[PDB]
Amino acid sequence: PHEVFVELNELLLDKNQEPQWRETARWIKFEEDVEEETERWGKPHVASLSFRSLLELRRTLAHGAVLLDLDQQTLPGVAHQVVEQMVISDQIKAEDRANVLRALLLKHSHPSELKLLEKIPENAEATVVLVGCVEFLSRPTMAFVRLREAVELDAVLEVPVPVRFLFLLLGPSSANMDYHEIGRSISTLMSDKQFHEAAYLADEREDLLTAINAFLDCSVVLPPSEVQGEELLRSVAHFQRQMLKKREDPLRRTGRPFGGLIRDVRRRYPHYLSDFRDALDPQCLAAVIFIYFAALSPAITFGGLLGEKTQDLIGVSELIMSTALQGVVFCLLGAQPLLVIGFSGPLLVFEEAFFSFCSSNHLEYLVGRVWIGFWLVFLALLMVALEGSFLVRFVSRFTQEIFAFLISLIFIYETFYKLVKIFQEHPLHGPRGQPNTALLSLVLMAGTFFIAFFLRKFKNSRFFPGRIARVIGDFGVPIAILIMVLVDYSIEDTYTQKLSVPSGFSVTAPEKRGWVINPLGEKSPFPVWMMVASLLPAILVFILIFMETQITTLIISKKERMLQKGSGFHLDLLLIVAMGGICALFGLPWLAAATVRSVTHANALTVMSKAVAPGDKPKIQEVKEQRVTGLLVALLVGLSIVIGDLLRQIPLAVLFGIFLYMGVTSLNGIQFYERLHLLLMPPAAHPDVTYVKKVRTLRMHLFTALQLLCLALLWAVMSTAASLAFPFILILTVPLRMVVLTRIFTDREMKCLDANEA
Amino acid sequence: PHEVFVELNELLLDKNQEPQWRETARWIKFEEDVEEETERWGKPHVASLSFRSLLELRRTLAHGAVLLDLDQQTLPGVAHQVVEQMVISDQIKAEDRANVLRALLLKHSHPSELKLLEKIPENAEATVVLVGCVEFLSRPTMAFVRLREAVELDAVLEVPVPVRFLFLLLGPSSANMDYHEIGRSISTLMSDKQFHEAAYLADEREDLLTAINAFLDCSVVLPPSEVQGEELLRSVAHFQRQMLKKREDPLRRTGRPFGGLIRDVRRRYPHYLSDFRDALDPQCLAAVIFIYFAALSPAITFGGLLGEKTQDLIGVSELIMSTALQGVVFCLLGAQPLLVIGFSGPLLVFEEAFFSFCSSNHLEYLVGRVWIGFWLVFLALLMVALEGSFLVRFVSRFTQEIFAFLISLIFIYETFYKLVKIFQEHPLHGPRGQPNTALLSLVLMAGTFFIAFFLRKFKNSRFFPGRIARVIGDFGVPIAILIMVLVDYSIEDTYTQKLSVPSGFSVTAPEKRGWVINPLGEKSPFPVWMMVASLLPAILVFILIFMETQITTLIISKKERMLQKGSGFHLDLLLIVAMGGICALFGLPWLAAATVRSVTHANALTVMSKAVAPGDKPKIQEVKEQRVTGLLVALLVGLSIVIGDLLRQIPLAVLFGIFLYMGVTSLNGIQFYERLHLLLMPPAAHPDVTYVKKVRTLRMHLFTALQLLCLALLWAVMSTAASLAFPFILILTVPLRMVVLTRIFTDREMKCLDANEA
């Protein structure tokens, strides 16, 4: 089976009023049409035919000329043999054979070479369709030629490809046939996957006719009624699938303890040296630059906020080093260095939720986190030993979207509650009570949000090339902070709460904390009941780390990602938590492998294949798969503590704008949020999605109501004094979905509403 | 020719495990398919067929049964006659005739009546397609029945329509034919405009077969290659037009002086009493409510700004009365009461531009406008007398889009220059010098912009029904002002510049001005050279009124608007200017018939026809065409001066936010702005628009550069001391387009780049 690039060049008059063949269309995949007015190739489109043209093609092909395995290699000699064969079958009178021969030898023309060769598959044989209105003849005349050898004909094609099938059609007008449409019909057949397969094996004129019928019976005949909108033709794609259908792992559990750890070590580690060679490509150097701002910006927005929530015990300087200390050690030893380890959003809403519990019960907060670390290590060892990392299968779209919607509700609430706090501390009247502090904070808070919100749309708009914005992922955030910091920097005599960052490798609050947190009680003795009961917070933390890291590994290890090298589930979970349990001893926060950063890292290294035919979705040729982009990003984040002066000038109102921005944008893409929109829209206006078409409106609104009810239970718990339990309530939905929603919704509805990939 | 509603109900098993015909699709126009999973009718779509099904239909129809002019009216009797005719032609054995008869008489079923009757044309005759898999037969069997009389059959259709054509098909499986697809093929043929026309006149089985060929030869045969995106199938609509194509005034000038005035008086005035009767419909009462906020909100945003630009000589109170004084008199006497007369944007940028000239040359500003009024009256009489209102043909998309883009540049600039003025008068430090005044003004200015900007998107989003938002046009502006006024109202001890509106029918600045401006000089004598040279500003004003009113009358008088009553060009131009020349004597501003308000008024009264088949674009059945909605809106605006306390609490920073909002949104829809976007995007990403497809990229960028160069000439003039001349420079583009761009661009390119309607 050979791929075919079929070119239709028609006999037309040039600007010099001379007859010459001009390329009118070409078929690599689908069809591209020359616009005579502008001499520009049109956008690729489905080669729609006219049934009258196909009927005329079938009529002329019967009693037509046939040149099979023509042992000729020169266009003039081939043309002379074609004319002889045509006059054998009485198609052309011997008087006009000279004129037909002269018409065959005319100079071909094209609108304009290396670029187009890339799109066509390398091992392809082109088909030339010579169709034109000839005046000296009185009857239409056709000749299908199959060359014995793939001979690159003499300057006949726009792109030099060995010509295999030569198609000739020369007939006068007034025959009620459009030769331009007959040329498109025969060219479309030759580009068809199965029609040319019958052309290679064709042995008689009847066989080629039978090949047409095998094409028509697989076709779609539209009616002559016109089309008013694109939604009318949306079902044509779905119907065309029905017609053709009628014609036609790391999570595996082994009994060996630490078995998943051993397999993942034996998979990626053999490619350790290869992990450093693949980094020499210049695309990796662009990944370091554009991901460094994707891993540093959330390191200060969460680092700054932890400075307020935890009274500067854990601030930016600790989160900067914790991101760098773990980011380097993970890349040097992890099985998936494409993961960007960082302080996830859900972990932030736990530290704020755990600080209140330690503040209420008169427990040292930092020492209370040391003992969570000692129990995070034990649970991580226990789970990896028993290979219990396959439970991420049960965490499905019902639980993920409830969580990702609850967090985005917290981010929106926490800024607006911070904003209300500012106005109550700095009321509008003619440090506390500072004029212009409340409003400038609102301007900065709403300045970075709308700058970053609109630049995200500009990223996704038609202005930015897809090949570029894939590499540079979410650059609105770094520039929004830079712009509004300078806006606040220019202002003088007005106080805005600045980021609390001390210069040098020092604690954010040196007077209150030391580098090594004493596990036995820093200032006051630590109660012996809490060091044993810290397992309960540790399980709740471990759920937030296990869910965030293992889901992320699932997202980037899919076959669509084209990750050739081994991806490790067990080895990453152990490192992310065993470092998190040891980084807690030094007061540094524990981290998870965030999904948004990791995909931004994975996308930046995806190399889209150049050999894509026009009109086809780009396919990921490969991914760089190196340990250096993750390593350098980790080191550069750690070196951000060198600029402690620049970070100290970032207003805290600027970060809350980004904090609100990340809350709002994370809603996009969540089916829970999308199905909340449908709760307001009328049933007629619901979009044609899988969960909408195959599920009736009433059942869909019941499913969304249950998710919304399961989200109000989480919010009620979070506002009470037992806010630590929201990880446990969250994974009560997994028993709920697998047991309660199983008997309410049929398997058909759950397969549509809870889809692993969609 | 009868419209046909063709229903395909197939023989299928019910939830009771009993055989009964179930409606699977219906064809009023295009096709709607029953989704078996949810029992919901799918969205209308083109009835795409499979060529195998059409071939099987043609095969079975040959040697098939034919019942033409069957003189029967009962479904059991018709079925028995059909069975007799089928067994005559050996299609069904006499042994199985009882089973076929039993299968014909089965109870039909449908998913669910008055609503669907509206969509179908009233005088229509339905076609029933009975297709099902019958097991007791060994061969497929078909019977096409054309009833002699249009008999509403016994509960056979979902919607009771007199059945004319009855189509029967009963055949076993294993015949390599999908009866559901054969049923869709025959149903699609019957719904075709020309196929059933041959069915009514059909006289033999051969004739019906020939009718199929007349259908296929007008069809579009898609290839079996799948479709990846909707842009692939976008060309299918364009190609389908080619296939079918191959098969197939008030501006008039008369020699009589004031001739246009007489015709327009003799056209609309006879319907004067009808203009008041048509207003009793409840839709008119909704127009008054929703347009009152569309005519009042720009009356204060321009009224407030004129308070600053003209030092409160002409403010809100004068613009409110001028809008009401002219709005009432125009509706009582104008030939097109659908016009909403109001202070256009271009007139605002002249009063600001004319005030500077009067301030620089030591001329009384208000007296200087009285003499422009006396010369506006004379020019209006002169133009209407000579019927020179046909010059609006020459003001084309080249001049309109240059103007509408220049103004939107002024609106954006004027707010940002006001905002800079506030900060320099109220600097940020720990009336003048007021703290919190500069930032709160920015918050209010950016508050109303983003509230109104996002609510405009919510208006156009899928959430808001199209039938509603057409009635309620641009309601984001009234609610944005209301929300941010309350936000500023709650604030205390902070000063924001409030609207300057005195309560009662009083001048905005009583100490400086009187109600009647003395034409001979109010305080100081008016120079006798300026009262004669005021013709020069009068011509420049008259261009801004003529261009804005006559273009608006063109926009709403198009045939697509379905304005049955006479629309007047000459009578409106005379009234709008002759009142404007007389309203200037009292210090009130002159007004034009704004396009945006008028279309918002015209749309609110358009009654969309209920008798629209599914999938068709709604057609405007009629427009109310009354003089009362315009009258009541005018009176309600005048009564807004009663609430002088409420208007006095609107901050001037709130209005500048709306002022900026109207500048930004007016850019949308302008091809000049759209072609500026293409100047940045690569040629591959250019949208498939008429001026893009038929004009090469280099020539299009030359045309846009010329427009951008012609916009920089206007801005340079406007920033100089002769800012009054921008009306004259603007209509220098009409000679430029008709003379200079004629020789640069071919008529093919100008027909695409400058399209009157697109």
Numbering used by the authors:
A (entry chain B), B (entry chain A): 320 to 431, 503 to 638, 673 to 854, 894 to 1221
From the study:
Anion exchanger 2 (AE2) is an electroneutral Na+-independent Cl-/HCO3- exchanger belongs to the SLC4 transporter family. Here, we report a 3.2 Å cryo-EM structure of the AE2 TMDs in complex with PIP2 and a 3.3 Å full-length mutant AE2 structure in the resting state without PIP2.
The mutant AE2 proteins were expressed and purified under the same conditions as wild-type AE2 and a map was reconstructed at an overall resolution of 3.3 Å. Analyses showed a strong density of the AE2 NTD which was not identified in the AE2IF/PIP2 state. The mutant AE2 TMD also adopted an inward-facing conformation with a RMSD of 1.704 Å compared with the TMD of AE2IF/PIP2 state. Because the substrate exchange activity of AE2 harboring the R932A/K1147A/H1148A mutations was significantly reduced, we designate this structure as the AE2IF/REST state. PIP2 densities were absent from the dimer interface of the AE2IF/REST gate domain.
